């Protein structure tokens, strides 16, 4: 269906311990495919998916030169930003940047985004129209003016509607086996006594891709959204995901309860009875 490519840059200062730590990482949908680490002895943009390894040396040569340049701008940014908020020299600080593009079912450009953050909070963001900025805070307006003056939004838009989308489409073709195919969730229910009058019913979903999923519990067809405990959807490590949802049930009524799984891998939404 719809798809996305995104890059996540993270730089963190190391006061009195040398140069900042830069980590870049690249995703298509919920699948990572590249990364760069300034602390890695490699000193190269490395692959983290099979379907990108087939790209030529020009790609790896170039991507590396670019990612190095990215880190160096963020390095300066850490200094400028400390000045903008006027902080001491002791204490580590963090800059993050997230950008990329979305495509529809038709693989045509849908949305572009570009966000910056200082010490965990929104700093500046490019708006939907890819023409104007959102200088959240005060100091951010300084940056906003520089970036308006240097027409940054125009070259970003150019990238987001141009090479971003075009290369996402290319990646989707090269990685067809991985990226365009779904892994339906493997499901099961477990039972644990809380007391002698209460028991937990847990609904599981394992080995599923993509990470998007919905697990809900129902008592006699009616949704139990309030007493349900969800866990953060977590990675299996093999490229699939896991999630469970649980409810507390009165002992001897488990049979009234059903679990409803929703996912692209499933042709139709699964309904799981505790007692068939």
């Amino acid at each position: 269906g719809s798809h996305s490519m995104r890059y996540f840059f993270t730089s963190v200062s190391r006061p009195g311990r040398g140069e900042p730590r830069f980590i870049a990482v690249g995703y298509v949908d919920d699948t990572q495919f590249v990364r760069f680490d300034s602390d890695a002895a490699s000193q190269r943009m490395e692959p983290r998916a099979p379907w990108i390894e087939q790209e030529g040396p020009e790609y790896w040569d170039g991507e590396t030169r670019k990612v190095k340049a990215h880190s160096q701008t963020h390095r300066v940014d850490l200094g400028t930003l400390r000045g903008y908020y006027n902080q001491s020299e002791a204490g580590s600080h963090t800059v993050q940047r997230m950008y990329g593009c979305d495509v529809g079912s038709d693989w045509r450009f849908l949305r572009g985004y570009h966000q910056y953050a200082y010490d965990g909070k929104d700093y500046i963001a490019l708006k939907e129209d890819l023409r104007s900025w959102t200088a959240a805070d005060m100091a951010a307006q300084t940056t906003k003016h520089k970036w308006e003056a240097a027409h940054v939004a125009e070259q970003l838009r150019a990238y987001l509607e141009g090479t971003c989308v075009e290369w996402l489409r290319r990646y989707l073709e090269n990685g067809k086996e991985t990226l365009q195919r779904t892994d339906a969730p493997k499901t099961h229910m477990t039972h644990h006594a809380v007391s002698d009058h209460e028991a937990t019913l847990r609904c599981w979903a394992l080995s599923f891709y993509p990470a998007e999923i919905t697990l809900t519990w129902q008592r006699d067809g009616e949704d139990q959204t309030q007493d349900t405990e969800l866990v953060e959807t977590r990675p299996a490590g093999d490229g699939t995901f896991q999630k469970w949802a649980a409810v507390v049930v009165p002992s001897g009524q488990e049979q009234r309860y059903t679990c409803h799984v929703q996912h692209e891998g499933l042709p139709k939404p699964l309904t799981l009875r505790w007692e068939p």
């Binding site: 991507e63 670019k66 940014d77 400028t80 930003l81 500046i124 520089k146 940054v152 070259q155 290369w167």
Partner: peptide, 9 residues
Amino acid sequence: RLSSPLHFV
């Protein structure tokens, strides 16, 4: 593929 180096803040 990465965008080209972006301006300082």
